[PDB]
Amino acid sequence: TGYVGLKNQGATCYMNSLLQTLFFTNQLRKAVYMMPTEGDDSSKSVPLALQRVFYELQHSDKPVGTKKLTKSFGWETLDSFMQHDVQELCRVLLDNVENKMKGTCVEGTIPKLFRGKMVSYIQCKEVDYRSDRREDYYDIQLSIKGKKNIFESFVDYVAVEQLDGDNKYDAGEHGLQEAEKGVKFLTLPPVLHLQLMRFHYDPDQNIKINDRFEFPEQLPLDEFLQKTDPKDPANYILHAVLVHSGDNHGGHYVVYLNPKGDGKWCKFDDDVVSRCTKEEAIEHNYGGHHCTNAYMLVYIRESKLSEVLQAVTDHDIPQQLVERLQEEKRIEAQ
Numbered sequence: 222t223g224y225v226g227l228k229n230q231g232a233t234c235y236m237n238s239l240l241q242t243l244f245f246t247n248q249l250r251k252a253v254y255m256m257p258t259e260g261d262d263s264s265k266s267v268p269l270a271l272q273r274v275f276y277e278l279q280h281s282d283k284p285v286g287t288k289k290l291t292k293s294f295g296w297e298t299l300d301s302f303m304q305h306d307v308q309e310l311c312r313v314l315l316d317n318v319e320n321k322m323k324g325t326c327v328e329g330t331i332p333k334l335f336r337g338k339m340v341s342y343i344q345c346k347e348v349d350y351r352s353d354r355r356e357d358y359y360d361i362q363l364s365i366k367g368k369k370n371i372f373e374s375f376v377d378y379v380a381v382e383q384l385d386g387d388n389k390y391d392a393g394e395h396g397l398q399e400a401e402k403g404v405k406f407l408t409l410p411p412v413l414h415l416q417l418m419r420f421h422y423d424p425d426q427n428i429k430i431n432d433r434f435e436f437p438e439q440l441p442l443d444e445f446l447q448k449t450d451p452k453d454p455a456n457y458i459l460h461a462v463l464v465h466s467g468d469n470h471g472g473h474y475v476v477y478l479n480p481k482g483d484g485k486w487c488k489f490d491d492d493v494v495s496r497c498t499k500e501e502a503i504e505h506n507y508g509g510h511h512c513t514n515a516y517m518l519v520y521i522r523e524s525k526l527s528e529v530l531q532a533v534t535d536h537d538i539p540q541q542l543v544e545r546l547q548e549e550k551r552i553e554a555q
């Protein structure tokens with residue numbers, strides 16, 4: 222396939238899937254290669270550890286290990302990953318690499334790639350008061366229970382909620398008031414991270430939601446924006462499908478990618494990477510009928526696709542870093 226896998230080194234759950242996803246965000250990968258990690262101590266540095274994983278994923282012929290990386294951000298106990306969501310790990314990783322890019326020539330790469338803006342509003346029904354606030358986001362958690370596809374998820378996510386009764390809004394000078402609450406999307410980022418809400422609480426444990434939930438290859442999002450742009454419609458192309466199979470923690474995590482965005486899909490199952498059909502990356506992961514389904518999707522804005530998937534060569538990795546990692550290998554070999 223020309224792509225290499227990642228080793229199974231414990232119950233790291235989504236971790237390898239997310240690492241392959243981030244590695245094939247080529248613009249992110251190049252920015253990570255530029256990070257000034259010469260002075261870093263290797264035992265403690267997450268940015269250096271992500272640099273290392275990416276370098277190996279780009280050059281290694283054998284499955285890549287991840288032990289230095291998990292040590293660097295300190296999720297080292299038997300159940301450390303079972304106690305966090307995939308977006309929490311992504312946050313830990315991207316926060317580290319963007320704090321490292323402060324003051325550098327690649328500062329802002331993470332906000333530029335993954336941050337969008339929305340508005341959260343409260344409009345009073347019986348008096349004249351509307352409270353607006355802008356929030357940034359790096360990911361979207363989409364409810365699926367009782368929703369047939371992504372589209373109904375986005376409708377449910379922007380739908381109006383009612384505040385009244387014993388839950389009425391405190392409009393300050395206006396006292397308690399009846400109101401509506403809601404969010405609109407102001408900006409959608411070039412890379413769109415969508416978690417699906419498949420891991421829930423039952424009337425008293427946690428259960429997996431294996432319901433059918435359709436997601437498309439091409440996703441139009443113009444109609445969930447507050448104001449659109451005719452020059453850049455909000456059309457996204459499906460880039461990654463992170464899949465879990467099973468109804469409990471004894472399940473198995475894999476990820477399907479079309480790394481180039483050209484519709485040629487591969488299955489990354491830890492150390493095995495294999496060519497797969499389009500039906501097997503997408504429809505076969507809808508759920509419904511089994512227990513195999515998507516819990517997270519990555520989309521790229523078509524207008525930014527080629528810039529986010531720009532070719533990476535080995536002259537993109539600075540020689541200081543190639544030297545440090547090759548010296549690491551050379552000490553490992555003695």
Ligand SMILES: Cn1nc2c(=O)n(CC3(O)CCN(Cc4ccc(-c5ccco5)cc4Cl)CC3)cnc2c1-c1ccc(CNC=O)cc1
Nearest residue numbers: 306307362416417418419420427428429465468469470516
């Ligand atoms: C409700 N909800 N569901 C979620 C979900 O599924 N994901 C994906 C995973 O993180 C978790 C499941 N993994 C797969 C798996 C592994 C084991 C089992 C299982 C079932 C029974 C025993 O073991 C079931 C599953 Cl599905 C893969 C990564 C991420 N976020 C989810 C949220 C959520 C909603 C709002 C906020 C607030 N945030 C901002 O306001 C924060 C989180």
